[PDB]
CSV table of C-alpha atoms in Angstrom, one decimal:
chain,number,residue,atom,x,y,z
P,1,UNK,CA,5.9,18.3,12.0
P,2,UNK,CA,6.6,14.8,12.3
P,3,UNK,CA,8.6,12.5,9.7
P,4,UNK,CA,9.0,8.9,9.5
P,5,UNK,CA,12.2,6.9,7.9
P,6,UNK,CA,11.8,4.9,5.1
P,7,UNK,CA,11.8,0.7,5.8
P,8,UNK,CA,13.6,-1.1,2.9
P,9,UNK,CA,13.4,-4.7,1.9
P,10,UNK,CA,15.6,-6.2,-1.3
P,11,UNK,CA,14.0,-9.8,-2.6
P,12,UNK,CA,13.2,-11.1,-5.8
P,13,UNK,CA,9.5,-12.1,-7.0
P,14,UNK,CA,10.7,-16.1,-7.7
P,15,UNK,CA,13.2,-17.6,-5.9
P,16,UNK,CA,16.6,-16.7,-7.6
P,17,UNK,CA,17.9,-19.6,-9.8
P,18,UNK,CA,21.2,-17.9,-11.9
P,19,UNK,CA,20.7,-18.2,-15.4
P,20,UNK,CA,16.9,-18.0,-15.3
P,21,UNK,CA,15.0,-14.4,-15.8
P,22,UNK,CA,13.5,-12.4,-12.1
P,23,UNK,CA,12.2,-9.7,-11.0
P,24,UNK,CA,14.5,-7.5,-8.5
P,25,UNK,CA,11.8,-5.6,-6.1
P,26,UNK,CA,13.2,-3.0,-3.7
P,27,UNK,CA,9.8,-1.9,-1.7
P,28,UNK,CA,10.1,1.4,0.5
P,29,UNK,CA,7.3,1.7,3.3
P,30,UNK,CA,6.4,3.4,6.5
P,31,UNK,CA,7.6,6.7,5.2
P,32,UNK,CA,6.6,10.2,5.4
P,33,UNK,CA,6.8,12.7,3.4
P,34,UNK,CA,6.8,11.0,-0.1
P,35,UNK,CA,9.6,12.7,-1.7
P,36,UNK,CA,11.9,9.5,-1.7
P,37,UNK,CA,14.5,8.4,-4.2
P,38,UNK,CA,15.1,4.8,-4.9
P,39,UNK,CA,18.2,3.4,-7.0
P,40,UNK,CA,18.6,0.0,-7.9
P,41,UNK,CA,21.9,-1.2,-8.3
P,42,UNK,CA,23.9,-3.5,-10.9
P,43,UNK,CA,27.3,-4.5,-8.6
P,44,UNK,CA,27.5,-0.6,-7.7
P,45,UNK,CA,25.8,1.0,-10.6
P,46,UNK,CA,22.5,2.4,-11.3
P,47,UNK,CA,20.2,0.7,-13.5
P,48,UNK,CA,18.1,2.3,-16.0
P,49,UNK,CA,14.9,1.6,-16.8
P,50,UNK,CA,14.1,0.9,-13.3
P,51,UNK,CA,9.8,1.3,-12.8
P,52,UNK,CA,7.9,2.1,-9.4
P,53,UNK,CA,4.1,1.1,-8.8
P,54,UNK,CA,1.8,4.4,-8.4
P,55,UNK,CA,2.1,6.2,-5.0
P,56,UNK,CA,0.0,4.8,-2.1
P,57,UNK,CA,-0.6,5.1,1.8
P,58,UNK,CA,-1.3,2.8,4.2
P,59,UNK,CA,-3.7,2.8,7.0
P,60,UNK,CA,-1.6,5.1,9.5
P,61,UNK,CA,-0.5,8.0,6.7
P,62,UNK,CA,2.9,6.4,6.0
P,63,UNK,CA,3.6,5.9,1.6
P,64,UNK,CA,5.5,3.1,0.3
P,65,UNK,CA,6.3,2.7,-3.2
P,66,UNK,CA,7.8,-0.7,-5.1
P,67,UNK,CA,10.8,-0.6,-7.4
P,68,UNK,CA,11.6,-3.3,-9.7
P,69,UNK,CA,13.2,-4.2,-12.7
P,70,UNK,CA,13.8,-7.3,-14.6
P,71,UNK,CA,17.0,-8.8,-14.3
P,72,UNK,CA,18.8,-12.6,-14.2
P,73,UNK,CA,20.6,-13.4,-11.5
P,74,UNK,CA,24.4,-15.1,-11.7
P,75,UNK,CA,26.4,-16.0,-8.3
P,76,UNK,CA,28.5,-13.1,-9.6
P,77,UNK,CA,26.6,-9.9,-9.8
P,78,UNK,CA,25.7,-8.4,-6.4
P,79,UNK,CA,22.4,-6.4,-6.4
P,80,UNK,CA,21.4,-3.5,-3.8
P,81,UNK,CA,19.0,-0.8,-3.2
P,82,UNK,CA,20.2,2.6,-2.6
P,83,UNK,CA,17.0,5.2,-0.9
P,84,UNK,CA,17.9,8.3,-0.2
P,85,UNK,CA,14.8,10.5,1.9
P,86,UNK,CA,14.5,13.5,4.2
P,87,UNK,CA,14.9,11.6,7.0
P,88,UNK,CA,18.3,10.5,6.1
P,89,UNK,CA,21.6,12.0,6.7
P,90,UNK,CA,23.4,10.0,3.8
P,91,UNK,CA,21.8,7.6,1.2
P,92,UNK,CA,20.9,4.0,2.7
P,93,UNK,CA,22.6,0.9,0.8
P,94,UNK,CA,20.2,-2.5,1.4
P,95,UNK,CA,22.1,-5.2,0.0
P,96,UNK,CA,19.9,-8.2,-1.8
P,97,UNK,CA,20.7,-11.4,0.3
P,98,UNK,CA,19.9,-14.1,-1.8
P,99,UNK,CA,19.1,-17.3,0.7
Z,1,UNK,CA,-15.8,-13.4,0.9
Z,2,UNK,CA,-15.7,-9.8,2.3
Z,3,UNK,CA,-14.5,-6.7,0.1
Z,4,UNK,CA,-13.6,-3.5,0.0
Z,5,UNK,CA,-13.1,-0.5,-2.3
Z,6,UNK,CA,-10.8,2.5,-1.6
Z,7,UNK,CA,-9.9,5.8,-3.4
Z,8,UNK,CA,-6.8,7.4,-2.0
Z,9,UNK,CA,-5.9,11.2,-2.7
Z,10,UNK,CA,-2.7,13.0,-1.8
Z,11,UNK,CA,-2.1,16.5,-2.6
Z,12,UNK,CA,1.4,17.9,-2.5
Z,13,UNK,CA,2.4,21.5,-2.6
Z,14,UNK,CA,5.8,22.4,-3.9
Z,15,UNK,CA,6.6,25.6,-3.4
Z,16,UNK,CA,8.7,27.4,-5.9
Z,17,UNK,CA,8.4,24.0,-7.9
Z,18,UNK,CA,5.0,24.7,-9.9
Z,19,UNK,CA,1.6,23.9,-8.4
Z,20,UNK,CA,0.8,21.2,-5.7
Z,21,UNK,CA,0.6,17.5,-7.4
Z,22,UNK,CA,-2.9,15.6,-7.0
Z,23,UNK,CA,-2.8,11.8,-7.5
Z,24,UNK,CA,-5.4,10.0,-6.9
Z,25,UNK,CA,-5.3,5.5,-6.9
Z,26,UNK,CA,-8.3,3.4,-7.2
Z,27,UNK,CA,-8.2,0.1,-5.3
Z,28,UNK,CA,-10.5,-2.8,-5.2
Z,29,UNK,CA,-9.1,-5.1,-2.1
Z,30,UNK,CA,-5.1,-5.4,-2.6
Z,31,UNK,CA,-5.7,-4.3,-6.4
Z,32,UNK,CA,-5.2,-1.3,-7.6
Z,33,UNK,CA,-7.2,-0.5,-10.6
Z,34,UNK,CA,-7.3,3.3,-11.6
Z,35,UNK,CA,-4.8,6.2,-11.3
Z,36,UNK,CA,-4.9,9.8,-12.0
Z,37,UNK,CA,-1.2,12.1,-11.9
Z,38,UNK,CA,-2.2,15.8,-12.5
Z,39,UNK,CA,1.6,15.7,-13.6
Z,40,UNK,CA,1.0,13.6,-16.7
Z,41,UNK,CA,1.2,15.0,-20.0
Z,42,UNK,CA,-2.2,14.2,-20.5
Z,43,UNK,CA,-4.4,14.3,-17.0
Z,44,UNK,CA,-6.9,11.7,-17.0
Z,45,UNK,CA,-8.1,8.7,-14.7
Z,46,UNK,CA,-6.5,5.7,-16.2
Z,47,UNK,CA,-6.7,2.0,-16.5
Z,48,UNK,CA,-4.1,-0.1,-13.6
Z,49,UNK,CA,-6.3,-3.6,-14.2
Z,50,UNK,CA,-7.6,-5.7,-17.3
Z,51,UNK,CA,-10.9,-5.5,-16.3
Z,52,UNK,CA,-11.9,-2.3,-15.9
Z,53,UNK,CA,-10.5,-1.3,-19.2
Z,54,UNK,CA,-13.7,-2.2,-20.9
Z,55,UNK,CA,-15.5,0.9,-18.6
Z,56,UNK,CA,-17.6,3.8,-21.2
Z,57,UNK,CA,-16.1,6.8,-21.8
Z,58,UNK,CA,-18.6,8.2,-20.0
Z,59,UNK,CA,-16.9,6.2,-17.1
Z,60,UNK,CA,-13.5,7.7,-18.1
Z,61,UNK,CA,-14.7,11.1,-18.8
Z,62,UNK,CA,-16.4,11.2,-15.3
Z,63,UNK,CA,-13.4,10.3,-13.5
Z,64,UNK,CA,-11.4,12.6,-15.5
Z,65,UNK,CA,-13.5,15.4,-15.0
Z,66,UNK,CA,-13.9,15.1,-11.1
Z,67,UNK,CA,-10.1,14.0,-10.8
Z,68,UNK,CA,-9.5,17.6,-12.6
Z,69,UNK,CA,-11.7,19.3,-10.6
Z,70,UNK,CA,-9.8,17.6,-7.4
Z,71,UNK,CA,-6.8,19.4,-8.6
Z,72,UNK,CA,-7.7,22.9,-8.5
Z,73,UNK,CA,-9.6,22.4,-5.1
Z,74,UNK,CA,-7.2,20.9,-3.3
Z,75,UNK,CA,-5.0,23.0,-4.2
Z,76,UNK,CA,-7.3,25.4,-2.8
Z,77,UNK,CA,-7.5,23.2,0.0
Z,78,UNK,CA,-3.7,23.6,0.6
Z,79,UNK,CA,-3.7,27.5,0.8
Z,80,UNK,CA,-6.5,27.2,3.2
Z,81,UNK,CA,-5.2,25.1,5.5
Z,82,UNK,CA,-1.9,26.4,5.6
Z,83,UNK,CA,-3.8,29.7,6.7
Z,84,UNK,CA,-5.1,27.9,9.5
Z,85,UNK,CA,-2.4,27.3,10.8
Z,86,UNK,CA,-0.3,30.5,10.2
Z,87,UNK,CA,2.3,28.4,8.0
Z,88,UNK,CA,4.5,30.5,5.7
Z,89,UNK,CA,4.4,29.8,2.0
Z,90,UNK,CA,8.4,28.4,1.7
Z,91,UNK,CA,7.4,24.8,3.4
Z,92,UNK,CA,5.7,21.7,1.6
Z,93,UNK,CA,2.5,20.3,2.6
Z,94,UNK,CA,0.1,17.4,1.9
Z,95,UNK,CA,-3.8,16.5,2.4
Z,96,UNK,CA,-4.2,12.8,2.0
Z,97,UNK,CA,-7.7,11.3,1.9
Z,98,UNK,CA,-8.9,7.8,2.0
Z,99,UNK,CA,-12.9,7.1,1.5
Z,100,UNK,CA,-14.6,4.0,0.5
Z,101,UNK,CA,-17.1,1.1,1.4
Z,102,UNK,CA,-16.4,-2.3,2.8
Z,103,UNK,CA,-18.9,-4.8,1.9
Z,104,UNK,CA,-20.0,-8.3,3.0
Z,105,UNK,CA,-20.4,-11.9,1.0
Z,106,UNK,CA,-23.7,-10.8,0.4
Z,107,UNK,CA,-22.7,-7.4,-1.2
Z,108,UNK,CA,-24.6,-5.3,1.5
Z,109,UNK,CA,-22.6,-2.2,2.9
Z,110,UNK,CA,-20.8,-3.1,5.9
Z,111,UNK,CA,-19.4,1.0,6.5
Z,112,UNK,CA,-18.3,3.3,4.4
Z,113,UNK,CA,-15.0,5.6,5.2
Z,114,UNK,CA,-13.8,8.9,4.5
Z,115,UNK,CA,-10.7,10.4,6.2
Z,116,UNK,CA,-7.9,13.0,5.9
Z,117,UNK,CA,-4.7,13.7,7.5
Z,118,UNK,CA,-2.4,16.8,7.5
Z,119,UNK,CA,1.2,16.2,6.8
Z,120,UNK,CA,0.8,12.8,8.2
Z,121,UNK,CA,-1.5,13.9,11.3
Z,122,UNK,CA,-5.2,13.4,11.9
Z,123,UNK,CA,-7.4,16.3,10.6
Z,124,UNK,CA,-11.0,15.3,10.0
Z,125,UNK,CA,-12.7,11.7,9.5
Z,126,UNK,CA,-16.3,11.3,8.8
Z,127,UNK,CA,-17.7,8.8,11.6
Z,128,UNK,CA,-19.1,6.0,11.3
Z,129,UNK,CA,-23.1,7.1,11.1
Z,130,UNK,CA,-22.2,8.8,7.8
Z,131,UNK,CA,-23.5,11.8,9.2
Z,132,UNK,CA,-20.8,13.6,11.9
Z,133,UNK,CA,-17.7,14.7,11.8
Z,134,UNK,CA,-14.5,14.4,14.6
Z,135,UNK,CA,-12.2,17.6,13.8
Z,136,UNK,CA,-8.7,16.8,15.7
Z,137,UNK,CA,-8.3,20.4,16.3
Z,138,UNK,CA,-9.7,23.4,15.9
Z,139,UNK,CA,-8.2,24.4,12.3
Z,140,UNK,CA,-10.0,21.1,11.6
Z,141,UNK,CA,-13.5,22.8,13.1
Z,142,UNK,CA,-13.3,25.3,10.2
Z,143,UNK,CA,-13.3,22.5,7.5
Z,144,UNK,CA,-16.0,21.3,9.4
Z,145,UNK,CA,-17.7,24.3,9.5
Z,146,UNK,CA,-17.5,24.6,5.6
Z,147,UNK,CA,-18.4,20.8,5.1
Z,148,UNK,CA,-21.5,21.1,7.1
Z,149,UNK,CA,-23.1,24.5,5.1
Z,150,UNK,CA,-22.1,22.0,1.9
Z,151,UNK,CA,-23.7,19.2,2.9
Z,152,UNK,CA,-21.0,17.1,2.7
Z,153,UNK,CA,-21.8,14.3,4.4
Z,154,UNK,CA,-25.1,13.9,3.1
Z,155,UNK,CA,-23.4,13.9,-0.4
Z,156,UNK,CA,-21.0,10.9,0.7
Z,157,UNK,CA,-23.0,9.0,2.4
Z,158,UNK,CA,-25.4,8.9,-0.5
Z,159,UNK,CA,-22.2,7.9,-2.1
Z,160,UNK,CA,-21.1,5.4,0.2
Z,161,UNK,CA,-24.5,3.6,0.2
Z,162,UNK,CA,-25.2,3.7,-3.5
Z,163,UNK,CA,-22.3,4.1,-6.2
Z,164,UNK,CA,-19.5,2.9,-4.2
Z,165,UNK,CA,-21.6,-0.6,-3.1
Z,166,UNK,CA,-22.5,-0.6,-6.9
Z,167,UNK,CA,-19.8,-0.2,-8.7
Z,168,UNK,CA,-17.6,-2.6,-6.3
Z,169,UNK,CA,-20.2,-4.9,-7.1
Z,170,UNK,CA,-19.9,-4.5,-10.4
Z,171,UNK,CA,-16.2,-4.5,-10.5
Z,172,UNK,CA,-16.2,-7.7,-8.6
Z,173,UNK,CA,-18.3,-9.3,-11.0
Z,174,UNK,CA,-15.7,-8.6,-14.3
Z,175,UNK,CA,-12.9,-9.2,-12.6
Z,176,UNK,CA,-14.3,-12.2,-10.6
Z,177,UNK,CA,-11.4,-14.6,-11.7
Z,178,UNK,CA,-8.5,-12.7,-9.9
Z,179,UNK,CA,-10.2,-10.3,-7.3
Z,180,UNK,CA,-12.4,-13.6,-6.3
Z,181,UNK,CA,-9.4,-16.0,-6.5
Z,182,UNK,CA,-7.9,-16.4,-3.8
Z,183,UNK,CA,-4.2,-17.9,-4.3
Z,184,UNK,CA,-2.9,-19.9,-1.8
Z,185,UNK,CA,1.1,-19.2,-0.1
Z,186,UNK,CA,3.8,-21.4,-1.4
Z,187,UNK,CA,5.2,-22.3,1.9
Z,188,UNK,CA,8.9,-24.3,3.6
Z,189,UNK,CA,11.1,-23.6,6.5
Z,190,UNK,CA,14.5,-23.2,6.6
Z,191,UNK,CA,17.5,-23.2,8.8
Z,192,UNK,CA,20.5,-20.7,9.6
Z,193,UNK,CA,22.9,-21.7,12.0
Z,194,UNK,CA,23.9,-18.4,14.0
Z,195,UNK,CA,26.4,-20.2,16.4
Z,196,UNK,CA,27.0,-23.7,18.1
Z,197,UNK,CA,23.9,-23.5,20.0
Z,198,UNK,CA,21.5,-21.5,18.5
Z,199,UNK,CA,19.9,-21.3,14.9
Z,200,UNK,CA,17.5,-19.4,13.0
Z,201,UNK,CA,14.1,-21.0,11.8
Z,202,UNK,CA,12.2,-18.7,9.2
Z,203,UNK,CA,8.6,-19.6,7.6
Z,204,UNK,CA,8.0,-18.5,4.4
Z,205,UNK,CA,4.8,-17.7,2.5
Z,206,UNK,CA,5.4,-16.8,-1.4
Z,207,UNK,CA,3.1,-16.0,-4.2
Z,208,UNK,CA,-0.2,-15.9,-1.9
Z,209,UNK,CA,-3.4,-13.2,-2.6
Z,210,UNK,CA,-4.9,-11.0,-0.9
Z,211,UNK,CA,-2.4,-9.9,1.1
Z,212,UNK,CA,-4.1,-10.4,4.1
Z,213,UNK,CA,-2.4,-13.6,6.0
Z,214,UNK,CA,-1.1,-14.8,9.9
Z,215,UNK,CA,1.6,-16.9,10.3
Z,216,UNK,CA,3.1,-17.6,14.0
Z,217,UNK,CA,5.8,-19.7,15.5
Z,218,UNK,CA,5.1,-22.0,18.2
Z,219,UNK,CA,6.9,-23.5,20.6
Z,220,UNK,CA,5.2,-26.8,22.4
Z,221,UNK,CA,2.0,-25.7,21.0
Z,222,UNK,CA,2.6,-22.5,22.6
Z,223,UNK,CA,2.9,-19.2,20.4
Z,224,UNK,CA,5.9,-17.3,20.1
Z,225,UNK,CA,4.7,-13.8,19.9
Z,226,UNK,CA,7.3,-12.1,21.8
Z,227,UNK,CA,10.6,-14.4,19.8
Z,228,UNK,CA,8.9,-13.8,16.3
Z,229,UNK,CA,10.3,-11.6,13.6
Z,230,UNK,CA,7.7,-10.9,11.0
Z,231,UNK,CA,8.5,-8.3,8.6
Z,232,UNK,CA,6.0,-6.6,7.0
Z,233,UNK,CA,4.3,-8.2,3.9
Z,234,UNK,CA,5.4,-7.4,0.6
Z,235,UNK,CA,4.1,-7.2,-3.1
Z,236,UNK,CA,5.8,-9.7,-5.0
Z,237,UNK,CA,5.3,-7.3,-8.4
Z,238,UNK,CA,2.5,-10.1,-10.5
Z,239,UNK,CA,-0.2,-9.4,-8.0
Z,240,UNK,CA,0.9,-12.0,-5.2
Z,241,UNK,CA,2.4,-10.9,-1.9
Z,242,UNK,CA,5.6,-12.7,0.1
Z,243,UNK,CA,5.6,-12.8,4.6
Z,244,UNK,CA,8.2,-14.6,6.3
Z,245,UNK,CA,8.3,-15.1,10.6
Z,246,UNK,CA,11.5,-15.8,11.7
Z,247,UNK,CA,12.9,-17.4,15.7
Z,248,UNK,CA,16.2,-18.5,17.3
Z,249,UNK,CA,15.4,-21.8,18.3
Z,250,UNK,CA,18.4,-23.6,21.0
Z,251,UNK,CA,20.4,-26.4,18.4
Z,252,UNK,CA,18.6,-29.9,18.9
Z,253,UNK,CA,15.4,-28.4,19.8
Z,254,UNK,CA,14.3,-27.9,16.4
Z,255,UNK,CA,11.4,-30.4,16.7
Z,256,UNK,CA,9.1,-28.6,19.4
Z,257,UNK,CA,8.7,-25.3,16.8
Z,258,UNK,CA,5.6,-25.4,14.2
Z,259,UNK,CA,5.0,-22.9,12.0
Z,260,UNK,CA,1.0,-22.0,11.1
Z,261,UNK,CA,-0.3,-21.0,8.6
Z,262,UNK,CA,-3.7,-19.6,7.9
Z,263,UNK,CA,-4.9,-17.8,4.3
Z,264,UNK,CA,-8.0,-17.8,2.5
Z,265,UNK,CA,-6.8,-19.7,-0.8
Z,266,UNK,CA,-5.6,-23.1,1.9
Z,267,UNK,CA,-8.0,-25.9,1.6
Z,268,UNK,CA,-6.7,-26.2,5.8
Z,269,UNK,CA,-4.6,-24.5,8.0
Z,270,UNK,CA,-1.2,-25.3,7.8
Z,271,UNK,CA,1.6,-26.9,10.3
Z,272,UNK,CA,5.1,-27.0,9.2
Z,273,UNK,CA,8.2,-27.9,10.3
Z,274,UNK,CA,11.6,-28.1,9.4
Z,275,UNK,CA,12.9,-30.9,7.5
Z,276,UNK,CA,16.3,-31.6,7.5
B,1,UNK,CA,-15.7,5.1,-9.4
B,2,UNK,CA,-15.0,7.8,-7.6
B,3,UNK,CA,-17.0,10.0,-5.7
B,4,UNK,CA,-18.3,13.6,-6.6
B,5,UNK,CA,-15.9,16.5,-6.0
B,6,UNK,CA,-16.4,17.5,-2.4
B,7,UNK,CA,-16.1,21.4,-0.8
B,8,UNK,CA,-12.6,22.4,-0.1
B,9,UNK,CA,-11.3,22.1,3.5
């Protein structure tokens, strides 16, 4: 049986501007199966009330999922995206790089 | 101008974990608009989009009713096929299926789809005629055994050429001023030195729908297939989708690189560069 | 809307 590893991509729906309200959107593709856990995180720490769209495929079987949560940006806080899936040995950190 | 409706189903057993999960999501395009979770508290096909909220309950009672039903056969579904191929009950397994129509300007049916998989592989697709089945293997034959004596294909491509055209129709008509808008990108170039000699040119398209989009690098009026990283488009989270292409241009040579950009919301194509 | 239940595979 054949499984696939999880692509990752950390980005913001608007451009970051500190001091101004976002969206921070962690989006999980080309995975399979769907069991996948997705953490976003506030300088190292999970954030509650975190929400993921509904589960999907795309056209070749794979799932991907989108996690966001609102948020406002400051040049001080560091955001990331922590995924943890089958096909990984330990969970995967994707930093959010701003520019 | 062309559109496309798409119902996707997985079904996930779980052994020792309760009974397998159904969901099944209701697109229209790069919209979703319906959703069913046989995990909820309360099962039942449910809104995803302003406008198909104002749908009958008869509407929502339908696609409750056949989402519920979904449940307990594919469930079924899952013990069967595990049979088939002599898998023991400890591992997890999931049917997905994708069916739907694609239809032109005009609203006539362009084809219609219906199509599983098997724990991520290829199991049986309807073809194209609406009328024949391609098994991948011969577990597959037996599901194609049962959907012939059922009539299956008769039944979806009855489907296929009547509700499905229909009701995308008619969901293209109430939700005409954001399934028929097309929003153009919000596009610029920038500029990442990655040594002396070398820096990194990236072309960005923000806040653009559908999703659907190509945007190439060229150098000297030449595409740079081969020297482009795209990643993969992704939902901005308000509808809109973001694309970037990215290539290592040689320092001073900045000028022979164009970016294009083609999407259904430009008035024209687009050529950018990057201004320093 | 979505289709009829079909037959089990």
């Amino acid at each position: 049986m054949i499984q696939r590893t999880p692509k990752i991509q950390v980005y913001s729906r608007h451009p970051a501007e500190n001091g101004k309200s976002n969206f921070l959107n962690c989006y999980v593709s080309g995975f399979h199966p769907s069991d996948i856990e997705v953490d976003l995180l506030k300088n190292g720490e999970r954030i509650e009330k975190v929400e993921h769209s509904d589960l999907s495929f795309s056209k070749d079987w794979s799932f991907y999922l989108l996690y966001y949560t609102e948020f406002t940006p400051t040049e001080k806080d560091e955001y990331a995206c922590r995924v943890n899936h089958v096909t990984l040995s330990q969970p995967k950190i994707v930093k959010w790089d701003r520019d | 101008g062309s559109h496309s409706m798409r119902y996707f189903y997985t079904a996930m057993s779980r052994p020792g974990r309760g009974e397998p999960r159904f969901i099944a999501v209701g697109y229209v395009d790069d919209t979703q608009f319906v959703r069913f979770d046989s995990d909820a508290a309360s099962p039942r096909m449910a809104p995803r989009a302003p406008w198909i909220e104002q749908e009958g309950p008869e509407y929502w009672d339908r696609n409750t009713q056949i989402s519920k039903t979904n449940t307990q056969t594919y469930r079924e579904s899952l013990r069967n096929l595990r049979g088939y191929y002599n898998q023991s009950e400890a591992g997890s397994h999931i049917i997905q299926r994708m069916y739907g129509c694609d239809v032109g300007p005009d609203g006539r049916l362009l084809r219609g789809y219906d199509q599983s998989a098997y724990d991520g592989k290829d199991y049986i697709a309807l073809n194209e005629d609406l009328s024949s089945w391609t098994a991948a293997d011969t577990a597959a034959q037996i599901t194609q055994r049962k959907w012939e004596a059922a009539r299956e294909a008769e039944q979806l491509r009855a489907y296929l050429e009547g509700l499905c055209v229909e009701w995308l129709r008619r969901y293209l008509e109430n939700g005409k001023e954001t399934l028929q808008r097309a929003d153009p990108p919000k596009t610029h170039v920038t500029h990442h030195p990655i040594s002396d000699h070398e820096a990194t040119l990236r072309c960005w398209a923000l806040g653009f729908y559908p999703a659907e989009i190509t945007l190439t690098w060229q150098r000297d009026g030449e595409d740079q297939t081969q020297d482009t990283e795209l990643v993969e488009t992704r939902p901005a989270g308000d509808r809109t989708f973001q694309k970037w292409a990215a290539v290592v241009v040689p320092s001073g040579e900045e000028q022979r690189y164009t970016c294009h950009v083609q999407h259904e919301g430009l008035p024209k194509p687009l050529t950018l560069r990057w201004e320093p | 809307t979505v289709a009829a239940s079909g037959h089990s595979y």
